[PDB]
Ligand binder design. Sequence first.
Ligand SMILES: *[C@@H]1O[C@H](CO)[C@@H](O[C@@H]2O[C@H](CO)[C@@H](O[C@@H]3O[C@H](CO[C@H]4O[C@H](CO[C@H]5O[C@H](CO)[C@@H](O)[C@H](O)[C@@H]5O)[C@@H](O)[C@H](O[C@H]5O[C@H](CO)[C@@H](O)[C@H](O)[C@@H]5O)[C@@H]4O)[C@@H](O)[C@H](O[C@H]4O[C@H](CO)[C@@H](O)[C@H](O)[C@@H]4O[C@H]4O[C@H](CO)[C@@H](O)[C@H](O)[C@@H]4O[C@H]4O[C@H](CO)[C@@H](O)[C@H](O)[C@@H]4O)[C@@H]3O)[C@H](O)[C@H]2NC(C)=O)[C@H](O)[C@H]1NC(C)=O
Ligand SMILES: *[C@@H]1O[C@H](CO)[C@@H](O[C@@H]2O[C@H](CO)[C@@H](O[C@@H]3O[C@H](CO[C@H]4O[C@H](CO[C@H]5O[C@H](CO)[C@@H](O)[C@H](O)[C@@H]5O)[C@@H](O)[C@H](O[C@H]5O[C@H](CO)[C@@H](O)[C@H](O)[C@@H]5O)[C@@H]4O)[C@@H](O)[C@H](O[C@H]4O[C@H](CO)[C@@H](O)[C@H](O)[C@@H]4O[C@H]4O[C@H](CO)[C@@H](O)[C@H](O)[C@@H]4O[C@H]4O[C@H](CO)[C@@H](O)[C@H](O)[C@@H]4O)[C@@H]3O)[C@H](O)[C@H]2NC(C)=O)[C@H](O)[C@H]1NC(C)=O
Ligand SMILES: *[C@@H]1O[C@H](CO)[C@@H](O[C@@H]2O[C@H](CO)[C@@H](O[C@@H]3O[C@H](CO[C@H]4O[C@H](CO[C@H]5O[C@H](CO)[C@@H](O)[C@H](O)[C@@H]5O)[C@@H](O)[C@H](O[C@H]5O[C@H](CO)[C@@H](O)[C@H](O)[C@@H]5O)[C@@H]4O)[C@@H](O)[C@H](O[C@H]4O[C@H](CO)[C@@H](O)[C@H](O)[C@@H]4O[C@H]4O[C@H](CO)[C@@H](O)[C@H](O)[C@@H]4O[C@H]4O[C@H](CO)[C@@H](O)[C@H](O)[C@@H]4O)[C@@H]3O)[C@H](O)[C@H]2NC(C)=O)[C@H](O)[C@H]1NC(C)=O
Ligand SMILES: *[C@@H]1O[C@H](CO)[C@@H](O[C@@H]2O[C@H](CO)[C@@H](O[C@@H]3O[C@H](CO[C@H]4O[C@H](CO[C@H]5O[C@H](CO)[C@@H](O)[C@H](O)[C@@H]5O)[C@@H](O)[C@H](O[C@H]5O[C@H](CO)[C@@H](O)[C@H](O)[C@@H]5O)[C@@H]4O)[C@@H](O)[C@H](O[C@H]4O[C@H](CO)[C@@H](O)[C@H](O)[C@@H]4O[C@H]4O[C@H](CO)[C@@H](O)[C@H](O)[C@@H]4O[C@H]4O[C@H](CO)[C@@H](O)[C@H](O)[C@@H]4O)[C@@H]3O)[C@H](O)[C@H]2NC(C)=O)[C@H](O)[C@H]1NC(C)=O
Ligand SMILES: CC(=O)N[C@H]1[C@H]([C@H](O)[C@H](O)CO)O[C@@](O)(C(=O)O)C[C@@H]1O
Ligand SMILES: CC(=O)N[C@H]1[C@H]([C@H](O)[C@H](O)CO)O[C@@](O)(C(=O)O)C[C@@H]1O
Ligand SMILES: CC(=O)N[C@H]1[C@H]([C@H](O)[C@H](O)CO)O[C@@](O)(C(=O)O)C[C@@H]1O
Ligand SMILES: [Ca+2]
Ligand SMILES: [Ca+2]
Ligand SMILES: [Ca+2]
Ligand SMILES: [Ca+2]
Lengths: 388, 388, 388, 388
Amino acid sequence: RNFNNLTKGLCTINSWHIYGKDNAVRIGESSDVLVTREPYVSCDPDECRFYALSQGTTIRGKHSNGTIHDRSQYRALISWPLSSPPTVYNSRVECIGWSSTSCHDGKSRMSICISGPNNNASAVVWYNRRPVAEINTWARNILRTQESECVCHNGVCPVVFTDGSATGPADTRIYYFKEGKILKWESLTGTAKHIEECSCYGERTGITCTCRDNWQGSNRPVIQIDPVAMTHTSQYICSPVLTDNPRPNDPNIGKCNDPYPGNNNNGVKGFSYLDGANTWLGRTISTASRSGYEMLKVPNALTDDRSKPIQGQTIVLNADWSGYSGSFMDYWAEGDCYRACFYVELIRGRPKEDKVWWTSNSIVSMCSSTEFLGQWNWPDGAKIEYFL
Amino acid sequence: RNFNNLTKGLCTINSWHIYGKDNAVRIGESSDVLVTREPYVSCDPDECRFYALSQGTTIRGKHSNGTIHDRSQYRALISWPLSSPPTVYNSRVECIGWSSTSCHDGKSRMSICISGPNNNASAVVWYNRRPVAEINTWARNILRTQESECVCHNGVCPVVFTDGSATGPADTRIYYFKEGKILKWESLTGTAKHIEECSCYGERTGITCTCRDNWQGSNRPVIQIDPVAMTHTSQYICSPVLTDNPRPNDPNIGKCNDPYPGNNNNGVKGFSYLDGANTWLGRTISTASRSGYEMLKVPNALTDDRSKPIQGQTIVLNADWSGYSGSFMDYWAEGDCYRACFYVELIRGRPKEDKVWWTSNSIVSMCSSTEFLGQWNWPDGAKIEYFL
Amino acid sequence: RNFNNLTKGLCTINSWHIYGKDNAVRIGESSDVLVTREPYVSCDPDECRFYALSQGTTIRGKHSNGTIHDRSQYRALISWPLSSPPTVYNSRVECIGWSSTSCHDGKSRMSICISGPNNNASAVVWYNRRPVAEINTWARNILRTQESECVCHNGVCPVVFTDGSATGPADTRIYYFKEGKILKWESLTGTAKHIEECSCYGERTGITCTCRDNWQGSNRPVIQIDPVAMTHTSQYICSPVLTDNPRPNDPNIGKCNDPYPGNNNNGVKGFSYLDGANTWLGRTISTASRSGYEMLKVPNALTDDRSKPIQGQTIVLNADWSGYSGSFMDYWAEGDCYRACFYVELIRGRPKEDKVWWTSNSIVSMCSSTEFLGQWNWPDGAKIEYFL
Amino acid sequence: RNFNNLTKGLCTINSWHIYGKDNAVRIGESSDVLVTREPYVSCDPDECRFYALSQGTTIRGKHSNGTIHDRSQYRALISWPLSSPPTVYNSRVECIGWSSTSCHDGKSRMSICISGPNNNASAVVWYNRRPVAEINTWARNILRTQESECVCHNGVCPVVFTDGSATGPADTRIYYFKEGKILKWESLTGTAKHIEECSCYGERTGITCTCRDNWQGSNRPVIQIDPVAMTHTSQYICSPVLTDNPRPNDPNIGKCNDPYPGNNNNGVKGFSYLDGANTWLGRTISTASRSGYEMLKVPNALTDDRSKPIQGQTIVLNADWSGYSGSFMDYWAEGDCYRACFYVELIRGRPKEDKVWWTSNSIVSMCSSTEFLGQWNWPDGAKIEYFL
Ligand SMILES: *[C@@H]1O[C@H](CO)[C@@H](O[C@@H]2O[C@H](CO)[C@@H](O[C@@H]3O[C@H](CO[C@H]4O[C@H](CO[C@H]5O[C@H](CO)[C@@H](O)[C@H](O)[C@@H]5O)[C@@H](O)[C@H](O[C@H]5O[C@H](CO)[C@@H](O)[C@H](O)[C@@H]5O)[C@@H]4O)[C@@H](O)[C@H](O[C@H]4O[C@H](CO)[C@@H](O)[C@H](O)[C@@H]4O[C@H]4O[C@H](CO)[C@@H](O)[C@H](O)[C@@H]4O[C@H]4O[C@H](CO)[C@@H](O)[C@H](O)[C@@H]4O)[C@@H]3O)[C@H](O)[C@H]2NC(C)=O)[C@H](O)[C@H]1NC(C)=O
Ligand SMILES: *[C@@H]1O[C@H](CO)[C@@H](O[C@@H]2O[C@H](CO)[C@@H](O[C@@H]3O[C@H](CO[C@H]4O[C@H](CO[C@H]5O[C@H](CO)[C@@H](O)[C@H](O)[C@@H]5O)[C@@H](O)[C@H](O[C@H]5O[C@H](CO)[C@@H](O)[C@H](O)[C@@H]5O)[C@@H]4O)[C@@H](O)[C@H](O[C@H]4O[C@H](CO)[C@@H](O)[C@H](O)[C@@H]4O[C@H]4O[C@H](CO)[C@@H](O)[C@H](O)[C@@H]4O[C@H]4O[C@H](CO)[C@@H](O)[C@H](O)[C@@H]4O)[C@@H]3O)[C@H](O)[C@H]2NC(C)=O)[C@H](O)[C@H]1NC(C)=O
Ligand SMILES: *[C@@H]1O[C@H](CO)[C@@H](O[C@@H]2O[C@H](CO)[C@@H](O[C@@H]3O[C@H](CO[C@H]4O[C@H](CO[C@H]5O[C@H](CO)[C@@H](O)[C@H](O)[C@@H]5O)[C@@H](O)[C@H](O[C@H]5O[C@H](CO)[C@@H](O)[C@H](O)[C@@H]5O)[C@@H]4O)[C@@H](O)[C@H](O[C@H]4O[C@H](CO)[C@@H](O)[C@H](O)[C@@H]4O[C@H]4O[C@H](CO)[C@@H](O)[C@H](O)[C@@H]4O[C@H]4O[C@H](CO)[C@@H](O)[C@H](O)[C@@H]4O)[C@@H]3O)[C@H](O)[C@H]2NC(C)=O)[C@H](O)[C@H]1NC(C)=O
Ligand SMILES: *[C@@H]1O[C@H](CO)[C@@H](O[C@@H]2O[C@H](CO)[C@@H](O[C@@H]3O[C@H](CO[C@H]4O[C@H](CO[C@H]5O[C@H](CO)[C@@H](O)[C@H](O)[C@@H]5O)[C@@H](O)[C@H](O[C@H]5O[C@H](CO)[C@@H](O)[C@H](O)[C@@H]5O)[C@@H]4O)[C@@H](O)[C@H](O[C@H]4O[C@H](CO)[C@@H](O)[C@H](O)[C@@H]4O[C@H]4O[C@H](CO)[C@@H](O)[C@H](O)[C@@H]4O[C@H]4O[C@H](CO)[C@@H](O)[C@H](O)[C@@H]4O)[C@@H]3O)[C@H](O)[C@H]2NC(C)=O)[C@H](O)[C@H]1NC(C)=O
Ligand SMILES: CC(=O)N[C@H]1[C@H]([C@H](O)[C@H](O)CO)O[C@@](O)(C(=O)O)C[C@@H]1O
Ligand SMILES: CC(=O)N[C@H]1[C@H]([C@H](O)[C@H](O)CO)O[C@@](O)(C(=O)O)C[C@@H]1O
Ligand SMILES: CC(=O)N[C@H]1[C@H]([C@H](O)[C@H](O)CO)O[C@@](O)(C(=O)O)C[C@@H]1O
Ligand SMILES: [Ca+2]
Ligand SMILES: [Ca+2]
Ligand SMILES: [Ca+2]
Ligand SMILES: [Ca+2]
């Protein structure tokens, strides 16, 4: 076949419809469902699948004790069929490690997993299910990457990595891969001051990534990548509609080229679709914790430091736990435009529910509609009391 | 490949033979079998599969408590191989929601799932396993559809939807899809006074649907659809052999253009094959509850308001629980005629068996034979005492 | 592709080597393994699979209680990959019923399942996984068939059926199918006096079946079928090496055209390879019960009523339970000859082990070698005490 | 397709990166994971898979009691997807027996399994998933083979077998197969004095095998095979870096043509990559038991009896249990060189952990990198206390 090229724009987003939901924690109460976290979704030309980092144990298994921890030798990137749960028997391992990204270039899939101790981690780049390239840590402090899908154009797939402090200046690099081979890498440029866990999408030969500032910012950094020139810029979302978590209350003036202050040394992976008047931002409803999730239509959020919402949709009630969120699109669907999609990780267990000793999640996913559809809310749906 | 066209008539039906049976509740006593209800069967050109609405839990799982309820965020349309049970590990999710239909047009499969709260539900139309179109509620009162397979002709697949009261006049629409796109919709016309859960089949370029009148009728409404003109008519089955449940005893004169009275605000999904002297009707044996199932040969049942049975076959004894029933056919089989098939849902658990706190079902399915075959009876076969 | 034709002879049989073994009862002690009985093996052009009649429950499931019974609505013909156990999650249902046969003609597979009450049973013939023909009971007394694979030549697949008494004269028919359609049937001719559960193989355009005389005989009946003329003959194995079970001790003169007396109203499915000086017979070691299994090389056993063994191989020790046995061959293997194969059913549970309330089996299978290989013995290997 | 030919050399090995890990014992604490031992890895042109000898029971099953034993009728060679665990539901049986090897020749896979009692064992050779040839024991004392993958060149696949004493001179043969047929065999020649469990790889039309001397040696024997001439030589690794287990401490002079003494009648399967200055040896860290695992870069280890390490990498800490290790490569990967890979068996249970009554393992696997990557350590990760 052929390399996918980003020739289309985004479809007009007037609401969001349910796309996938795996009910993993409900089902895992009485089935062999793997403990996971950091999920995402990624499409092949002939299939869309769920992805996540396994913890190498089932939820009901005794080894689920202690799975609040992020990095171990027992983690792996797995994938499984859309809206099924991640089971021992239906999950496919993509590579071994505790930080990942993955994407299809139209011909084959690239998957990247990072493993190792904090001071000696390394990335292995797989292409067509074979290891092709390796990258050693350059700052010796938890080499880490996107935790959602990358995007490819004409065979070139950019990936954002960070190595260094989670609470001060770090060393972020953008790598450009083709068939798993390193074409080029560059150090981060622009005005973003701290970058983690970028969520990306592609449109009209440009790639846009919305990231997490874990140091001083509660507005989100944005990286804009030209996959042909293999260059990038960075800044923050200018809008005063702040979308990190935890975060201050929304002001009336945002910040384009610096972190908006109030909350230090924390954050959550999130995403946005930045498309002029067709702009939608995702965020937790709570400003204090990872609970609730909503989409807000915020015209020109990227560039207008006074911009406010004109429409919205609740995805997860504030009474229910959320978690990481990220972007993906089916680049191989029919039609003249790409349909914006996203997922929300619904974290259950520790630290917020400490009557159990495990941490896991389920997944809900939505795609955009040109209709103005009615909204529901989409909780994980499991009862903690059943696990006691 | 090519779009299927409805070029054949029905085979002569002289008896029914066993086609499929999944023994799901028996097997689920000690395996990871999903709780379901509203099952059906649908064929692809190369495979026939079972379908149902999952409840997002296994039977032995503690989340099975409360599954008598019809609409939740944890339901999804799943499919799995013919006569296997619906397990966590072998079930494929088609889309998310609590009311569905699905059919193959010869090239790809269309699946439709409705989700949302009662006053804000929406349908998402999937084609070739991608979302293609969306339809918002128009009466804000449980938008709902067939719960068995649709039928396609030359790429055009009609689907019947209802939105509005279950106990008074409602707003029924027939939608005509092609490759998941809306070609046209029309409001219900004809003399049917209330329409729910249509069971359809196709023959000689016409589609016939047998539905449920939940308001005042215990005779079944019939919709006849011309998929080329994209028009329809409606009436009731004229025969005094009444086939809803619950229902009055059979009179000697039926009603062609109005509900036959006696039982209000209830019913069950059912089906018929209306083919002149080759006409067969399905119904529960009990007039009071969903127990037993039988087929009756009732010549010209559609148009003769004096017609009575001349032959029959018991499928499920009155001593055993039944449930929904519906039609399907293998439009891709060999031969000069289409073989009529049907399924019966065998409901176990609540409300009729309240020693357990769950509701689920298994499936039995039959197809027609030109032979005069001996009959058996086909119970679910599970013992409730084992689940206590 | 093309219809297989029987153009080769049997390979020289100098010993037997292990082919497959599924350890089903061992594994089912702690996994979701279906209760089965009446297993066999059958090859497709690209795969060989195990087959059996499921009982619609797992071994550890509470519905395993009572599975000594042979005929129920919860039985089905299933198949699963060679040497795996029959699990809920890996088994494919071929058709519904409690007596079966199945074979591949080179293009597609035909499967036949019989279901119904004792006085009203019927066979459904499936071809390319669709129902094609049906056959009603003709003697109203447990219509029944081979319980191992049929054999095809140039698209024509003969199958032996019996309807009527298990303890007196019955009505046996040979049906000739092509693409699931009935070409012809004939009533049994020749000198066999009672026929059940034929085990067949094909070579040089002839099909040979070794059957079970359940009435008066402890020598086995043989049916020889010409699939081109669609005619047959029948007799008994002439050898005094008797191979039914239970049976008298071996005399020095056998019987060619009548039952050898001593044991009435019982038997077991078995097989032989009748090939002049290359003749091998299978039998239980015990004359009283289904325990042990051995192969004996008995030159001209079919026609020589004085013939005795000149070589042998123990398959299952007399200290271990056996059961049904039958023939199959890979008609699509490389080489100038067909390699003779067989399976032995290893029955565990009731009636011989009544500390449990279930009956199931595992499978061992062997194929012939031109080498003189060392022998092992191949028990089921499960410990009944573990199931208590 | 075409037979693979060994046209490439080894890639430069500057470090090792994680390739696969199945966490089988962790996951098997609460899932239907088969008990195994003697694992390995082998690639097809389109897939790489894990292999092992099953014990015909799950870990949590009661039949796991006694699985320290090596040879039983319930063992089989199974394969399953890379980095998944070996489950009842995802494992494919290749053949039946208790000693094995397997390899793909570019067109189809050959698998060999040995079964039988100690004095009457036999090998069955499968090709394209059909039995093709058989080999009877020639010394009547546990006929046995490699327990890791063989290597093919232009359709010819050499395999090393041993029959005879484990504690004195034995009869080793090299067999040369093509499409499962025996082309030739030869008796072992050269200076190796005892050969078991060879680990092989291929490069530039030569095959190199590193074996186990179980009699008097703690240096490893090496067999070098010319698959075109179908001839071989043998010797020992000359280096004083000793790599058997148990073993003496490293001297300063090794032995090229005789066993290095100190430890009798024991050993462990292991491997090396012998490639001049690109030479790397694997070994346990402990000299006394199967604990820890490390790679050492030992230039010209094969031929230099003074050679010492100049670089290394720890794979498994000495505090953690290891086991067998072996070589494999993806002969169908892209690039101008073959990437060296290996696996380490991580044995859990008896004899070292006798609070449980079973013996099983998990797998870790690495491949070489031209980068100098940071190292981690890779334990099995299961807690024995959870199994009590
Ligand atoms: C069936 O389903 C449908 C479809 O889902 C349901 O309809 C949906 O209903 C929801 C809920 O109401 C709507 O979401 C909200 O949308 C509003 C925005 O819409 C309003 O404002 C628009 C802009 O108005 C301004 O500009 C125009 C210029 O043209 C000017 O005219 C106007 O005066 C004003 O200057 C209006 O255009 C718009 O009107 C239109 O739409 C109406 C329908 O909604 C319609 O009736 C009209 O005729 C017209 O067509 C409308 O008035 C969002 O503002 C809102 O989001 C805020 O509120 C939620 C809480 O509900 C909160 O979670 C959000 O985060 C946000 O509030 C926070 O952020 C603000 C920005 O900083 C801040 O100002 C707030 O104080 C608040 O901040 C606090 O909370 C946050 C979060 O914790 C925290 O971080 C902060 O620090 C701080 O603590 C909702 O998104 C959908 O748009 C609507 N969809 C459709 C298609 O109608 C329907 O209800 C369902 N039916 C039933 C029966 O259930
Ligand atoms: C082996 O297997 C075979 C194959 O399955 C078995 O054979 C089958 O046996 C079953 C059971 O008997 C049969 O089903 C019944 O069929 C009859 C219809 O057939 C009869 O009537 C025909 C029509 O007669 C009328 O017209 C002709 C004009 O030509 C005229 O001559 C005649 O005088 C009369 O005017 C006859 O043609 C037919 O004869 C033929 O067939 C005979 C074999 O059956 C054969 O012997 C003859 O020689 C001839 O060839 C035959 O007489 C159905 O009426 C019946 O269904 C009613 O009864 C069941 C209870 O059994 C009930 O559940 C049904 O719902 C229905 O009864 C309700 O509805 C009626 C309609 O409103 C109503 O009038 C009733 O009062 C009753 O209503 C009550 O109950 C319902 C349900 O709860 C409730 O809703 C109401 O409100 C009310 O409370 C059966 O379907 C098969 O047809 C037959 N198949 C074959 C191929 O033979 C065989 O038995 C097995 N063997 C063994 C050993 O087990
Ligand atoms: C490693 O593995 C190898 C390979 O598996 C093992 O070698 C195998 O060993 C087994 C066990 O011994 C052998 O099976 C037996 O074979 C004999 C037949 O072979 C003997 O007889 C041949 C025929 O002799 C006659 O004809 C020739 C004419 O040429 C004439 O010369 C001769 O005098 C006589 O007239 C001989 O040719 C043959 O010799 C050859 O082979 C020898 C090796 O075996 C070799 O040493 C010689 O040099 C020569 O090459 C040999 O003498 C079968 O008879 C026997 O089966 C009977 O016995 C078993 C019990 O063991 C029983 O279960 C069978 O059912 C059968 O006995 C019953 O049926 C008879 C027939 O009616 C009846 O007469 C009996 O009384 C008995 O009946 C009772 O029991 C049954 C069953 O319950 C019941 O139904 C009845 O009613 C009644 O109660 C075995 O099959 C293999 O052939 C042999 N294979 C090879 C390749 O060598 C080796 O042992 C292993 N190594 C180790 C260390 O373990
Ligand atoms: C992040 O990750 C990176 C990458 O993994 C980590 O860096 C790695 O660190 C490990 C651990 O230190 C290294 O492994 C060791 O390598 C040494 C070999 O390297 C040394 O020696 C080289 C050769 O020196 C000789 O020749 C040169 C000629 O050119 C001459 O100049 C020199 O004087 C001497 O004559 C040196 O070239 C080399 O220097 C280079 O590398 C340095 C970095 O390592 C660098 O700083 C230098 O500038 C230069 O570039 C270096 O000095 C192995 O010797 C060693 O293996 C031994 O020790 C381990 C224990 O640690 C033991 O398990 C091994 O089995 C082995 O020791 C046994 O065997 C010996 C051979 O018989 C014997 O002599 C020993 O006594 C011992 O024997 C006992 O134990 C065994 C086992 O139980 C038993 O069987 C015996 O009987 C007996 O009881 C390690 O393999 C990696 O090479 C290194 N990799 C890289 C790329 O740097 C980094 O640490 C991580 N970072 C953090 C923060 O964690
Ligand atoms: C490689 C790694 O440890 N990633 C972890 C990151 C980093 O800690 C932060 O991004 C700070 O760098 O955040 C999590 O803890 C979190 O917030 O839920 C989860 C994730 O596993
Ligand atoms: C969308 C929805 O709720 N469908 C439900 C329907 C409606 O209640 C009725 O058709 C009245 O409209 O009927 C059921 O309750 C029933 O009778 O078993 C099941 C089904 O799930
Ligand atoms: C259709 C049917 O019932 N087949 C059964 C047959 C018949 O009873 C006999 O062949 C007599 O006809 O034999 C069995 O009981 C048996 O011997 O183990 C098993 C089998 O299920
Ligand atoms: Ca932050
Ligand atoms: Ca009604
Ligand atoms: Ca008999
Ligand atoms: Ca040794």
